[PDB]
Amino acid sequence: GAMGSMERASLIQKAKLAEQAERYEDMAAFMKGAVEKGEELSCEERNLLSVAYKNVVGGQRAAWRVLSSIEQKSNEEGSEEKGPEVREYREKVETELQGVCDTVLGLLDSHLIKEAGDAESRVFYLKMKGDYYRYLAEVATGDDKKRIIDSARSAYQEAMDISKKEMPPTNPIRLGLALNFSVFHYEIANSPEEAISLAKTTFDEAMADLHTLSEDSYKDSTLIMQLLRDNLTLWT
Template identity: 45%
Template sequence: MSSFVPYHMEFEEPLTREEYVFLAKLCERAERYDEMVGFLDKMVLGTSSLGELTVEERSLLCMAYKGLVCSPREAWRVISFIEKNGGCRHGDHATIIKAYRARLEADIASICGRILGLLDSHLNLSACSIDSKVFFLKMKGDYHRYLAEFKVEEERNKAIEDAMAAYKEAEDIALADLAPTHALRLGVALNFSVFYYEILNSTEKASRMAKRAFDLAIADLDNVDDESYKDSKPILEFLQDNLRVWTEERMSEL
């Protein structure tokens, strides 16, 4: 009886920039985010004279890391909820829960460290356009925010400080050089306000920031073409949803 022997295709790496992008798209379709990240990392680190990433390339990189970190972050939230709400009251089970939570935190920290290293060593340095600078600074703020979600004491303070600095720099550039309706400017406002709400527990500051961004964008909608509006519309909806929730929260506390 013959047995099945799997065939493993080996790529003759390094591949071209276009080949790495093509493979990343395949991985995205298959939801193989770990491999997607690997191919895009190799593109950034291994392609000589890479220069600035294209809009497509940076979007793929963002989706790859977001897809990779999403699962352990969601799992961490579930396990933390169980731990805090006494899902298992026996000592042995509590120890197991704590150990598993620590493993998830290590996974998240590894992913965040990987992209933050890439941002500091390559992506932020090669960013020339306003869009690229804002995009990667926002991304830097996001991954420091993810670390701040579970880090404690000095490590948490450092993650908060680094997230704040990245978001603030992205915000300063966006406010100076991008239209109020620009998707990147709105994205910075959305994530920065979430940082204030979730990490700093400042509902008032988060609400003010989100409302300002939303109101300025709505006032400028007449100057937006259909394509730009398509990009901005979902972010405006997120801002509006957050504002409603945060306003109701503040009213209930009065």
């Protein structure tokens, strides 16, 4: 680890600086270094970790989609053979994406999840595990594709079970988990009806619990509720 000589607190400070500078690869490297110090992460620190890698992998996914689209068109009837370059470069980006996903999954497995006992930490990490298996699933085509999908499903399901037992229905982690598990159903598991049911039930149960919240908690919860509605509108 090239961050092994830097203080944990300095890594966290520099992750925040990297965020301000929109240097998300640096942010992710700093937060990986912080995780590798071996201490549990606070709430703020968990969100720095997730923000960093979500931005990095989000850019990779967008690039992969562009290249996959070009590749599929190069393979339509009538196309002019362009050689191996489009496939090669899509493969390059894909391998880099898989590497980022494997890095995050490795941090969760060594040893963030096993030390996470509070619902807010454990659900957050299991959601991340489902998310990064989902990104692996998006590019998977081989003998392992079904197992990658089931790994995402299993992580999301454990997170869901804990969240329903231990968090209120407006908890933003619970809401974001359900949002993403619903997208997993729609886009990965070929289960649009499950996706729609989950989004609707999550939205309605949250609606009924909003009366318990402060103004600031209300803003946080209704933001994610709007994303659930947005997806439902896309899908119906």
